[PDB]
């Protein structure tokens, strides 16, 4: 149903569109990382106007129609209920990992192998830390 | 006043079956990433702005709501298979799409649908016989009622 | 800028043989003649038609397709009414009537192209119809003795089911014979007194 | 608990066939062998059906990140000789005996899936000319 | 006589049936199947069969004709002969009326995937044969076969007992000719805008 | 006619190493390569199979030019 104006993507196109959306989201909170982050002027779609440099609030008040970006927004919101202080860092690291995955795909590595390698690398990094 | 076809006409000939094949292949490609336990997930958004991510064949079929009259037949068959069997829902769709792809060159060469249907029925009967032969059910042949488990 | 002469009735749709409408009507009928040509025969095929309620209709009956299809041209309406009459009076042979009428019109097109007046074509068709109707009396090979037995009923039931559901005629014929035998009275060799009614048997389905 | 779950699933349906595409490969090989002794368009249709039966293992390998060409070639080479239990191993990218590894799927599930796919394909392809209303 | 609730395929229904007294004159057919399209097609076939059964009355109901186009070919030959005998311009119309009946074997051959270029001449030869005598003999009831796996020529009707009702074919021919005459008799269409 | 027949027969005889024509070579090569491809793999099986299938064009074209059903004739040739 509702076939008209129904969005669809191809493999080679989706694998790049998702990464572009991830980069666009990462640009939202890139400047807010660290104590010296920049304050952003946001007006929510409900009319809430405020100035803050908190990534959690920035992502909560900033809505968008990009489904891939909605995944990052939902992940940030879910994290906000746990610690909430690493939202900007988590989003930045996820964006960097997605860019690296895009680079690997351009080199001919299947996404599942990239995910497994990232999981193993995260395990090793956590163990070292 | 009331028009059953809503003023839309349709062509006749191999074009209709070719278009049906194209629609079925589109559905097969849409459901392809979800095959197998490692199949990729698909993000589907309903008209009510509800987003669901999952690789379950039944969920994908339910949320897709194919509008093409022909592919809807395959969607309904897959839904019936899932409801009655519950296993292989995506496999049926994939096999149907592959058979539709294979049938395209035969139609382009002038082979009638009856011949293709009869050949598919014969091949499926042979496949059923081979499955029955391959089927394993051991009670006391080189095993026991518990050793097999 | 182009002058219009010879038109005095109205600007509404109007067709005359001066422009070859006698062949245009046949061509228009051919649109559904081709549709119905794919239904007759044991190896017939159904078609997908979308109802006004958004439902999907699939059937091998040409009459159902015509009912679910929009009829505009009066020439097509004539054949639709003929098919309805065939179904109501006889209950079977709608595909036969439709295809025969389509082929008769197709050959009439060739006759018109040859230069034969429509009056002679109609007279010859009437004569050939009378000859064929008289000949059909001598073409009989077998005959149903009206024993009301399942074995004799199957002889007629089996061909009727064929061309409507291919591959299952063996079971459908047995089911129909069993259903009929439950309602037929104890009588044989009596064709003047009706015994069997179309509504005497109800059909239901369970998934 | 793990072993009990495994044996429970096995006992729920004791009629099983080799998984990992081994059953599909065996069916395809048998269909090709029969077609080699069948004349007419039936041979072409049977060959097409047998080739189509290999889609499931191909797509499973593709989704698993394995090299589809090499894994399929190895599966064809191994399955064509000796035992018919050779299939795709997903723990490691190679071909092995799924029956020995206890990798299986119900036979009835396979039969039902094949029947449903055949019915859908025939129903969609049963009509060459159609006049379909819009709605 | 008996009223009970019966379970068929998991669904329970109530049945009112008669055994000894007040024997019912009606019966019910219950269809089972996992596909709705197949069930609908079977229901249509059952309805058509029930309607046809009612047609077995005296007015040519019991009379049987050779089906699968054999009757059509015989009618083609007879009408062609009549048109050849018929003088005047009516011969062309009679011949075209005969040719119009060639569709049935053509439709049967095409729907079965058979090559018409070979089936049609084979049918013509089978129905137009020369025998060592003044009366035709042998297999004069050859029809149009569908085969589908392997076969040569066509099979005789008596092999499968494919027969058609005389009344049905006769009434269908009459109605088709009437409709064709009505359509052909219209050489101008005039309508008024609503 | 004798001159023409002698010319053609002499041409046939002078060839001391001949192979049957009329699609025999193409079909035999197709079958042999189809059998062979099942023993190679290594990414070459697909190419060998496609090359084998390619040779079937000649018999198909010959059958089409003969006003016959090419599918049936080619299938019978492959079966033989």
UniProtKB/Swiss-Prot annotation, chain A:
Known function: Molecular chaperone; assists the folding of proteins upon ATP hydrolysis. Known to play a role, in vitro, in the folding of actin and tubulin. In yeast may play a role in mitotic spindle formation.
Family indicated by similarity: Belongs to the TCP-1 chaperonin family.
Subunit structure, as described in the record: Heterooligomeric complex of about 850 to 900 kDa that forms two stacked rings, 12 to 16 nm in diameter.
Gene behind the chain: CCT5
Signal sequence region: none
Name this polypeptide is given: T-complex protein 1 subunit epsilon
Species per Swiss-Prot/TrEMBL record: Saccharomyces cerevisiae (strain ATCC 204508 / S288c) (Baker's yeast)
Localization in the cell: Cytoplasm
Source taxon at top rank: Eukaryota
From Swiss-Prot, chain B:
Localization of this protein: Cytoplasm
Top-level taxon of the source organism: Eukaryota
Function of the protein: Molecular chaperone; assists the folding of proteins upon ATP hydrolysis. Known to play a role, in vitro, in the folding of actin and tubulin. In yeast may play a role in mitotic spindle formation.
Assembly and oligomerization: Heterooligomeric complex of about 850 to 900 kDa that forms two stacked rings, 12 to 16 nm in diameter.
Family: Belongs to the TCP-1 chaperonin family.
Protein's recorded name: T-complex protein 1 subunit eta
Organism whose genome encodes this protein: Saccharomyces cerevisiae (strain ATCC 204508 / S288c)
Gene: CCT7
Residues of the full protein shown: 10 to 158 of 550
Swiss-Prot record, chain C:
Parent-record interval covered: 7 to 213 of 568
Cellular location(s): Cytoplasm
Tree of life domain: Eukaryota
UniProt-recorded name of the protein: T-complex protein 1 subunit theta
Name of the encoding gene: CCT8
Native source species: Saccharomyces cerevisiae (strain ATCC 204508 / S288c) (Baker's yeast)
Complex and partners: Heterooligomeric complex of about 850 to 900 kDa that forms two stacked rings, 12 to 16 nm in diameter.
Family from the record: Belongs to the TCP-1 chaperonin family.
Cross-link (Glycyl lysine isopeptide (Lys-Gly) (interchain with G-Cter in ubiquitin)): 9
Function text: Molecular chaperone; assists the folding of proteins upon ATP hydrolysis. Known to play a role, in vitro, in the folding of actin and tubulin. In yeast may play a role in mitotic spindle formation.
UniProtKB/Swiss-Prot annotation, chain F:
Localization annotation: Cytoplasm
Cystine bridges: none
Transmembrane portions of the chain: none
General function of this protein: Molecular chaperone; assists the folding of proteins upon ATP hydrolysis. Known to play a role, in vitro, in the folding of actin and tubulin. In yeast may play a role in mitotic spindle formation.
Subunit record text: Heterooligomeric complex of about 850 to 900 kDa that forms two stacked rings, 12 to 16 nm in diameter.
Family: Belongs to the TCP-1 chaperonin family.
Protein name as it appears in the record: T-complex protein 1 subunit alpha
Species, as recorded: Saccharomyces cerevisiae (strain ATCC 204508 / S288c)
Stretch of the intact protein here: 401 to 480 of 559
